[PDB]
């Protein structure tokens, strides 16, 4: 899995590639890593998968529920705060290590949170197998001040780094840019560099080919 | 990590590196290991982050209801519950923290929790892995009573030997100065401390 | 229809807890005792009636330490206040455990008063039947407060409650007028044996006994401490002297 | 220390009554007056906002609440109640149903958690019944729009039009001439605000009277783009501009 | 007055009394009469025990908490056995855990602190047993008197029960006497059984009658009944 | 481990179970009965760790018979197993799990027909005509798969268990002193006196 | 403290009644009337809706007929919101026992339960009872076609007919007079309505006030089908019965 | 040893034109040996199926968990549950155990009533929602079973060439595995009609 | 008896007679205070009184400092108010500890409001006698004043006031706001509020004041604190000066 989140002058983005695995297996060929944890702050996450929805739909709910109460925008900060002390109590054991970010009425946020509970503030973050790639990129590039397009290309080339050098990590590149002024904008499978070549052969079968034993009608009224 | 904390005439000054890794790896270059748990208590952690931010989070909490109801915490007060965490979860914590902190009655202190949770006041405190290779070092040339710009000067030296020596040390060394005057954070980059 | 005196935390139409009020008449009927705040420190007198020869002279304390530095003492039913005062003292280790530093009196003085107060809330509990004057001395200065069975406190220059309170008041004030720069804490205790002595007007059908203690970072050291043998004497003499 | 009524405070008398909800049904016949009607395309749920003083600040004080994106809320009785019945409502959203199968109830299942809240209240250990009858205004995929009324003994009933509080006689009679099963949003929004005049003493206006409308997904409301199959809440107050616009046509 | 305020220990009366535990106290007054006296160097108690026919028993009055340190009971005897149980125990732990005898002093603090919980919570009855504390402490002789109002007071000498106040006025005289009988448990003891004739409007003290306990210097806390009290009378 | 096999014929249930119980080195009984009867039409058999074993099929015959006196009816076989799986899926999640697989032979009334249901001590359970757990269906199944018919008497049932059980005798290293066979049908629940001669 | 406030909900009069009982049935008393039929092949349940307007929505509405299971329904008489606590619960129960025994609840052991958890509050506790009493419509392959009732007592009895709520001796009075055991449904149906048509405190009786549901076992299947009339049903049927 | 292979199975999943299709064998067995035969993996609540393969008893439990919560829920919301909102039942069910989990890979399977779409999803044991819309394979031949899906499957199949792909991928894939097969069994799902057709196959 | 009348159930009118008599008891200190906002300040002034020569006058105070940006006044008796005190203390720091930022005022009013609610419905707890008036210099809102009192109501105030001669002070606060048509003071200077409030004090009441009269708190972005003696002496003499 490859994560990254990259701040800009008046924003963030966050992207991620799109390879669910299990062992050496790809179980899903285009998951959405890329989760919302209210309308601006977004979530991206690493290591058990269960435990990264799990563990940003609870905190998106409470999330929604303090934003009701306060009759305030939810803040970054209360997301952060809410994750790291609900992954410490559980001391590593849910297996969630996110980067999260987004724009609130503060201004625009990027932070990085672990296991255990630990978190990291940064201009520029990656999580999962691809890190070190997606990292290359970043160091390589990051600069004070990017505009949103060069953000973008910055993010989406860090997933490409992942992509096509970390086995954990392939597929596409989905995004999701947080601007100051304006809507969160999820652009689900921004780039698909990855189409499966036409196959060589059909095969589709002849009807009749599969041995039945007995056929029956199933009732599912009432 | 190489974090260090020193008692000089006006006060005290706090300074780290900036360097945490996951094994071999730099997991973050820039960190911030001088922490705020009240306007003039600060804290350098050692350990693990998640303990130790984990503790310093509650600290902060209890000074500001501290603050609410009594005012002005001492800074042995700081030390004391801070130290009530690490001795009382000494089996499930790996925290090393040094506490300094700027109070007008007793100007600068320096308080060190190793490990176990036990509490030492001191003159100067130094910690982290980095800190062995400038036991020497720092013995030789602290002094009681120096200026601002010593004292800064002699934690920039010992962290940037700490950081010579210490894979686990790096980046930029983080100065928080404590005193009457206020509270001035300072930076320092590889490009200056390489050279001394 | 009434009865809204039956219970405890119910509110009369005024707005009233009748019971509380009840509970300050127990402490009317008590004991006089009185508080002095000097200029380093607190002294501390209460009378105690000797029903007969056969209570032990010096025996009976009626004053308690707090920690190491604060007194307390109260009128009206003695129970009620030791109870008060086991719980400051669970109070004050607690944050002398947390916090390293002994409590400060304002700190104490609130800790007490949230108790008290508490027992005006429910109709399970009845309200203390004490006032309790306290204080000592902290990282800056002395204090001296006095705590009423609403829970209601303050800090005071003097204090007095029980059965001779009136006079101690007047007393006090007196003294408050002709030392308007200070008192020391020497002056106090005899100034207090002699305020408790004038008190004894009311209940002058029995004999009584004079209990002091003080708490002066000068003559104690900060340290809550019982007035006993010489000074306590020159204490008595100065205020049967005075009492012509 | 330690609640010790453990025993109900609402018992049965000899006639059969229920005294406190009975009291609580009074607190409520003295309510401002609140009410709600259903159209073909939308549901609309109104009051009379009666502020206390010119020195408080009204729109500090919303009696109209949403409690899921499509669902919202609006009193007569106790405000103070319902306030807390408002955090109670959107809590329970999330516990019993957000939380299990990842979308917002239905209305009637909203309603029915919050009306056994109100039922426990009437039977609990030493409390009192909440002084209050909701309108809770809805929609959802399955069941299209629908109003429902929420009283003190936790009975709910499902209502094409309603008023609730101080006049709700004649406006429930108002409402019975002008209903019919034809009426979009705007005729009944119009409707509502003619009803609402009847109850009003002084300044009739955006400023106060509030009103909120569960109608058409508003997505210039969701915050993010990108995911189609949201298209953002149904539930919208309107503000005091659109109001008065509105009083024009009146 | 009275009437609406005195049912249960939770609610003051107008004039800030608490008549549950006065009726508590009442219980006391109508117990058998019990003295307690002490010199320098021994405390005797000396109790009158009620029997109930002259078929039945006389029930005991003394019950002994520590080697230094017993008392005396008037009121309920089963709130004595509480009280006292309670005693035994805290004696207990000063010796396990500081290897320590409990002073006499501090006894009282817990049995008034023991008390008040039962005067000021819903639920609870006050103690309806008064008692006459005896003991042999690092400061010397002691008897305490408690009330369950939790009223605890440090004394010479005492009695309490009916007509308890013969003796208590016999005591109040004979004190520069009494309070002089150091090293003659003999002597202390027949001024006690004098204190106690000053209660008897009543009848007589026999053998199967009276009880008498003593504590001192060299003596453990020990209770005579029976035969044992025969040189007395 | 200990032998418990089922067959379910034509009418009936039959259910055989080891006579053998052995604490480590001795063999302690030649004679122990390792069965419940449930309610007059349903009969359970049992073999797993030691205490477990017994403690569990009496708990089980306990509750069965407070629903047979409540209801002043008797639970179908059917129903009495979902019970019971019920119960050692609990089990297999608790503290100390039971560690008990059994067999469940009934006839049911309302159906007309024999069901012998299979439970391990996990919760697993299967409707079958024949089983077995442990070792013994190894040994057995080959022979049952051979000559199984859905068709036949009590007799044929018998003659086959016979079989099975010399086919057991001569292969498994273990001595378990024969089996206690019983019938279970529309008439309740009978044992064969003799297999041992039979 | 408290112990004024406690109205005692759980104790006997002198004449060995259970006073809160009692209040609660007549409470029930003026509730809309529910009337249960059972026949051979089906039951019947009829109920009718006390107050409505114009303005109430009778497509959504339920406030009288709820489905326990496929096979189980009631009808209720008394507090709405106190009936849907108990129905809720019973639907639990119903789905524990399928889960226990892979078997659908016999009527009776649900009847049962539920009327032991209204006997409950009548015992300990000190919490009002429920003001609730029910008709239970159910089929089970035991005892067939099965109709109980239950009051907040948590007594149950099992009836050929029964009403509960307003007026239920008219109501019996009508039942027992028309009521032969060969009834088969359709003809029930007609009694049903007939006996509330006879019974109502309004002018007449429109379909708007009425709530109706059979089981029947669904003419064509073999199985048993539970049918919960929508208005037009209802509408239909008060016609074809003749009472247009 | 491993709770997931002690009694073996397989189930897949698979979308085509207004149609969804489900399969699993019919095995259950205890390690090397063969126990059942007649097996079935596959469930349904209304219109929604769910399959589910790992340790058979909880493979039961499961059943009967969903069973109790589908049935609440159609007395309370007075219709059936969809695909999409039983996809999440199951995923917060699986989860509420996640440190005690059910052993089990389930899969879901059907067309929402409404809008006609044909959906399936795939969990891992503690409840990862596996969304992808062309097919979705879980138990002890599941290597086997991506292996022939990815190869077999094309987009908008016609139900009666669906049918085909997807008894070919589970009986070939069940071949290759020990501890699947002994039987098998083919859901075909329309907004209509649902049939259910047993395969021949090798009983080793 | 009048069993209604001593809990917190409904009489037969509905009402809460408990609740009506909690209201009573905020007024038996005979103290008045006043809130207003500044542009960018908010302002709140209490009368002090200290009947007794033996009290130490800084310890008498209705004004708490409940958070780095949240104060409060209280009107009611003193023990109810730090009960009151010390409970906001106590939520206003696990909010920030719990979600990382400082608890607004609104909200704070909002959470004391619902407590409040509750001893308003559960017989067993009762009312606290006193009216809350929080002030700050919100972060998103900016100026605030939001008021709860013992039925567990709570709004937002452009100003206000609280005690026996409330109206005295309303009235007059109303007639300058009518005037000047905005719903703040338009002061760049928390100086310039406090002199204001002091004036329309003094104006609504018919009264002078000795800067041992008042008690003053202000707060601004980022801090609330109290005044001085000596502060409010220099505002007495600035309000005397031109006047």
């Not at chain 7, 059972?38 to 009829?46: E, K, N, R, T, Y």
Request: proline fraction near 3%.
């Amino acid at each position: 899995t490859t994560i990254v989140g990259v701040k800009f002058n008046n924003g963030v983005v966050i992207a991620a590639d799109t390879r669910s695995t299990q062992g050496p297996i790809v179980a899903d060929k285009n998951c959405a890593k890329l989760h919302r944890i209210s309308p601006k702050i977004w979530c991206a996450g690493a290591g058990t998968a269960a435990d990264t929805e799990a563990v940003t739909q609870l905190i998106g709910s409470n999330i929604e529920l303090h934003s009701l109460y306060t009759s305030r925008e939810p803040r970054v900060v209360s997301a952060l705060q809410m994750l790291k002390q609900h992954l410490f109590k559980y001391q590593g054991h849910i297996g969630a290590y996110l980067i999260v970010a987004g724009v609130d009425p503060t201004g625009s946020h990027l932070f990085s949170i672990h296991a255990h509970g630990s978190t990291d503030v940064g201009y520029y973050l990656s999580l999962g197998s691809g890190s070190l790639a997606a990292m290359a990129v970043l160091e390589s590039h990051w600069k004070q001040d990017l505009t949103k397009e060069e953000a973008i290309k910055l993010a989406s080339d860090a997933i490409q780094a992942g992509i096509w050098n970390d086995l954990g990590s392939g597929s596409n590149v989905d995004v999701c840019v947080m601007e100051i002024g304006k809507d969160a904008e999820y652009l689900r499978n921004y780039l698909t560099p990855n189409v499966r070549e036409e196959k060589q052969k059909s095969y589709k079968f002849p009807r009749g080919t599969t041995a039945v034993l007995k056929e029956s009608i199933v009732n599912i009224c009432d | 990590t190489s974090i260090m904390a020193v008692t000089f005439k006006d006060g005290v000054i706090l300074g780290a590196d900036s360097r945490t890794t996951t094994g071999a790896y730099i997991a973050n270059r820039v960190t911030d290991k001088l922490t705020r748990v009240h306007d003039k208590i600060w804290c350098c952690r050692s350990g693990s982050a998640a303990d130790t931010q984990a503790i310093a989070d509650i600290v902060q909490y209890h000074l500001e209801l501290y603050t609410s109801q009594y005012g002005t915490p001492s800074t042995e007060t700081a030390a004391s519950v801070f130290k009530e965490l690490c001795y009382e979860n000494k089996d499930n914590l790996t925290a090393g923290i040094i506490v300094a902190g700027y109070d007008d009655k007793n100007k600068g202190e320096v308080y060190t929790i190793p490990l176990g949770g036990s509490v030492h006041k001191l003159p100067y405190a130094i910690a982290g892995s980095g800190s062995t290779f400038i036991y020497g070092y720092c013995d030789k040339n602290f002094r009681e009573n120096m200026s601002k710009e010593e004292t800064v000067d002699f934690i920039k030296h010992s962290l940037s030997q700490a950081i010579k020596w210490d894979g686990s040390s790096g980046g930029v060394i983080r100065m928080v100065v404590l005193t009457a005057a206020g509270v001035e954070r300072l930076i320092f980059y590889p490009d200056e401390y390489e050279q001394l | 229809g009434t009865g809204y005196d039956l219970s405890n935390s119910v509110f009369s139409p005024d707005g009233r807890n009748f019971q509380v009020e009840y509970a300050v008449k127990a402490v009317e009927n008590g004991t006089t005792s009185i508080g002095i705040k000097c200029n380093d420190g607190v002294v501390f007198a209460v009378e105690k009636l000797i029903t007969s020869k056969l209570l032990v002279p010096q025996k009976n304390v009626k004053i308690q330490v707090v920690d190491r530095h604060i007194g307390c003492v109260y009128s009206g039913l003695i129970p009620d206040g030791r109870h008060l005062v086991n719980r400051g003292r669970e109070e004050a280790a607690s944050f002398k455990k947390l916090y390293k530093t002994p409590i400060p009196i304002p700190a104490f003085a609130d800790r007490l008063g949230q108790y008290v107060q508490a027992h005006t809330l429910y109709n399970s509990v009845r309200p203390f039947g004490v006032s309790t004057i306290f204080g000592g001395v902290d990282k800056n200065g002395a204090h001296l407060y006095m705590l009423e069975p609403s829970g209601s406190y303050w800090g005071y220059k003097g204090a007095a409650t029980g059965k001779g309170r009136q006079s101690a008041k007047a007393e006090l004030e007196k003294l408050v007028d002709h030392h308007p720069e200070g008192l020391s804490a020497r002056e106090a205790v005899k100034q207090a044996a002699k305020i408790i002595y004038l008190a004894h007007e009311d209940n002058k059908e029995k004999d009584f006994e004079l209990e002091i203690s003080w708490c002066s970072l000068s003559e104690t050291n900060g340290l809550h401490k019982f007035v006993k043998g010489d000074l306590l004497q020159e204490a008595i003499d100065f205020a049967q002297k005075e009492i012509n | 220390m330690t609640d010790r009524y453990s025993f109900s405070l609402t018992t049965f008398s000899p006639s059969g009554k229920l005294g406190q909800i009975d009291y609580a049904l009074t607190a409520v016949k003295q309510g401002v007056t609140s009410l709600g009607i259903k159209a073909t395309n939308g549901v609309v749920i109104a009051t009379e906002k009666k502020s206390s003083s010119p020195l408080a600040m009204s729109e500090t004080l919303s009696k109209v609440s949403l409690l899921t994106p499509d669902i919202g809320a609006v009193y007569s009785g106790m405000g103070p109640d319902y306030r807390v019945l408002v955090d109670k409502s959107r809590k329970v959203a999330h516990t019993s149903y957000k939380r299990i199968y990842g979308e917002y109830p239905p209305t009637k299942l909203l309603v029915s958690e919050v009306a056994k809240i109100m039922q426990e209240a009437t039977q609990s250990g030493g409390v009192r019944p909440f002084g209050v009858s909701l309108l809770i205004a809805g929609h959802d995929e399955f069941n299209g729009f629908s109003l429902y009324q929420v009283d003190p003994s936790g009975s709910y009933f499902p209502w094409k039009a309603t008023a609730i509080g101080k006049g709700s006689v004649a406006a429930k009679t108002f409402l019975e001439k002008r209903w019919n099963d034809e009426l979009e949003l705007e005729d009944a929004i119009h409707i509502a605000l003619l009803t609402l005049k009847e109850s009003v003493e002084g300044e009739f206006n955006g400023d106060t009277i509030e009103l909120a409308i569960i109608g058409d997904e508003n997505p210039d409301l969701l915050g993010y783009t990108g995911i189609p199959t949201d298209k953002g809440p149904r539930f919208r107050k309107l503000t005091s501009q659109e109001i008065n616009d509105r009083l024009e046509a009146l | 007055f009275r009437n609406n305020y005195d049912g249960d220990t939770v609610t003051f009366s107008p004039t800030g009394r608490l008549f549950q535990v006065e009726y508590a106290l009442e219980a006391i007054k109508q117990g058998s009469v019990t003295v307690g006296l002490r010199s320098n160097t021994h405390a005797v108690l000396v109790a009158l025990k009620r029997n109930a026919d002259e078929l039945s028993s006389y029930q005991k009055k003394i019950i002994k908490c520590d080697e230094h340190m017993g008392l005396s009971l008037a009121g309920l005897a089963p709130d004595a056995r509480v009280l006292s149980n309670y005693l035994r125990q805290q004696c207990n732990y000063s010796s396990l855990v500081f290897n320590r005898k409990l002073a006499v002093e501090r006894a009282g603090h817990l049995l008034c602190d023991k008390a008040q919980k039962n005067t000021q919570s819903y639920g609870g009855r006050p103690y309806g047993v008064g008692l006459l504390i005896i003991g042999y402490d690092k400061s010397g002789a002691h008897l305490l008197e408690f009330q369950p109002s939790g009223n605890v007071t440090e004394l010479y000498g005492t009695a309490i029960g009916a007509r308890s106040q013969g003796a208590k006025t016999y005591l109040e005289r004979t004190l520069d006497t009494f309070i002089k009988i150091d090293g003659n448990p003999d002597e202390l003891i027949k001024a006690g059984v004098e204190a106690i004739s000053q209660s008897l409007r009543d009848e007589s003290l026999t053998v199967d009658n009276l009880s008498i306990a003593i504590v001192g210097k060299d003596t453990p806390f020990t209770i005579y009944d029976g035969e044992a009290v025969a040189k007395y009378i | 481990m200990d032998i418990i096999l089922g067959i379910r014929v034509q009418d009936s249930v039959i259910l055989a179970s080891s006579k053998a119980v052995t604490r480590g080195i001795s063999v302690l009984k030649d004679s122990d009965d390792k069965t419940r009867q449930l309610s007059p039409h349903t009969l359970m058999s049992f073999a797993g760790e030691a205490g477990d074993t017994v403690q569990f099929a009496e708990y089980i015959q306990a509750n069965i018979q407070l629903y047979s006196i409540r209801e002043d009816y008797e639970l179908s076989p059917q129903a009495v197993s979902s019970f019971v799986r019920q119960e050692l899926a609990k089990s297999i999640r608790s503290r100390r799990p039971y560690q008990v697989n059994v067999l469940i032979g009934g006839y049911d009334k309302k159906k007309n027909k024999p069901e012998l249901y299979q439970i391990d001590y996990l919760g697993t359970k299967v409707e079958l005509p024949y089983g077995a757990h442990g070792y013994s269906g190894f040994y057995t199944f080959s022979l049952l798969d051979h000559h199984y018919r859905p068709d036949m008497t009590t007799e044929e049932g018998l003659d086959l268990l016979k079989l099975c059980v010399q086919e057991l005798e001569k292969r498994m290293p273990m001595d378990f002193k024969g089996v206690i066979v019983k019938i279970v049908d529309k008439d309740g629940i009978r044992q064969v006196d003799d297999f041992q001669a039979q | 403290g408290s112990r004024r406030y406690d109205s005692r909900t759980t104790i006997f009069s002198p004449e060995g009644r259970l006073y809160q009982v009692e209040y609660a049935l007549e409470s029930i008393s003026h509730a809309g009337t529910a009337i249960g039929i059972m026949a051979s092949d089906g039951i019947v349940l009829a109920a009718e809706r006390k107050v409505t307007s114009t303005l109430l929505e009778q497509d959504t509405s339920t406030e009288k007929l709820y489905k326990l299971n496929d096979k189980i329904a009631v009808a209720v008489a008394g507090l709405t919101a106190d009936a849907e606590i108990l129905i809720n619960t019973a639907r639990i129960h119903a789905q524990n026992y399928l889960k226990t025994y892979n078997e659908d609840i016999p009527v009776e052991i649900l009847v049962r339960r539920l009327s032991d958890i209204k006997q409950g509050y009548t015992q300990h506790g000190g919490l009002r009872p429920f003001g609730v009493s029910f008709i239970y419509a159910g089929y089970d392959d035991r005892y067939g076609y099965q109709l109980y009732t239950s009051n907040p007592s948590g007594n149950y009895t099992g009836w050929k007919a029964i009403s509960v709520g307003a007026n239920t001796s008219a109501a019996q009075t009508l039942l027992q007079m028309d009521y032969k055991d060969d009834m088969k449904v359709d003809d029930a149906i007609e009694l049903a309505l007939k006996t509330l048509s006879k019974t109502t405190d309004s002018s007449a009786l429109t379909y708007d006030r009425l709530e109706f549901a059979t089981i029947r076992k669904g003419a064509n299947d073999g199985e048993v089908y539970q049918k919960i009339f929508k208005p037009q049903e209802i509408k239909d049927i008060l016609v074809k019965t003749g009472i247009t | 040893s491993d709770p997931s292979s002690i009694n073996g199975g397989i189930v897949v999943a698979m979308t085509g034109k207004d149609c969804v299709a489900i399969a699993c064998d019919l095995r259950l067995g205890s390690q090397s040996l063969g126990v059942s035969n007649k097996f079935e993996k596959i469930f349904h609540y209304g219109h929604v199926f769910l399959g589910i393969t790992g340790l058979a008893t909880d493979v039961t439990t499961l059943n009967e968990m969903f069973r109790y919560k589908t049935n609440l829920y159609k007395l309370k919301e007075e219709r059936a549950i969809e695909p999409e909102t039983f996809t999440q039942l199951v995923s917060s069910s699986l989860y509420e155990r996640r440190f005690g989990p059910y052993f089990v890979g389930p899969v879901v399977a059907g067309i929402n009533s409404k809008s006609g779409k044909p959906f399936i999803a795939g969990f891992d044991l503690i409840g990862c929602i596996d969304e992808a819309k062309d097919f979705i394979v879980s138990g002890t031949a599941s290597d086997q079973l991506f292996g022939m899906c990815e190869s077999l499957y094309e987009p908008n199949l016609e139900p009666e060439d669906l049918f085909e792909t997807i008894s070919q991928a589970l009986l070939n894939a069940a071949d290759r595995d020990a501890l699947s097969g002994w039987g098998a069994v083919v859901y075909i799902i329309k907004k209509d009609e649902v049939v259910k057709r047993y395969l021949k196959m090798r009983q080793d | 008896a009048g069993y209604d009348r001593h809990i917190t159930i409904f009489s037969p009118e509905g009402r809460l007679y408990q609740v009506e008599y909690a209201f009573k008891a905020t007024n038996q200190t005979n103290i008045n205070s006043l809130a207003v906002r500044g542009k960018d300040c908010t302002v709140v002034i209490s009368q002090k009184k200290v009947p007794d020569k033996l009290l130490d006058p800084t310890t008498v105070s209705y004004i708490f400092c409940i958070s780095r940006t949240i104060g409060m006044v209280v009107n009611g008796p003193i023990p109810d108010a730090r009960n009151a005190a010390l409970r906001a203390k106590a939520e206003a720091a696990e909010f920030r500890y719990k979600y990382g930022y400082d608890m607004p005022c609104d909200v704070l009013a909002k959470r004391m409001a619902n407590l409040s609610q509750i001893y308003t419905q559960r017989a067993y707890m009762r009312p606290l006698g006193v009216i809350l008036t929080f002030v700050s210099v919100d972060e998103e809102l900016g100026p605030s004043i939001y008021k709860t009192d013992p039925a567990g109501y709570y709004v937002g105030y452009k100003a206000t006031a609280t005690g026996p001669k409330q109206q005295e002070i309303t009235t007059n606060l109303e007639n300058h706001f009518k005037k000047s048509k905005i719903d703040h003071i338009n002061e760049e200077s928390w100086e310039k509020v406090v002199e204001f409030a002091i004036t329309h004090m003094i104006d609504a009441l018919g009264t002078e004041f000795s800067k041992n009269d008042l008690e003053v708190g202000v707060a601004t972005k980022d801090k609330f604190f109290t005044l001085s003696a000596e502060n409010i002496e220099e505002r007495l003499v600035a309000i005397a000066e031109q006047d």
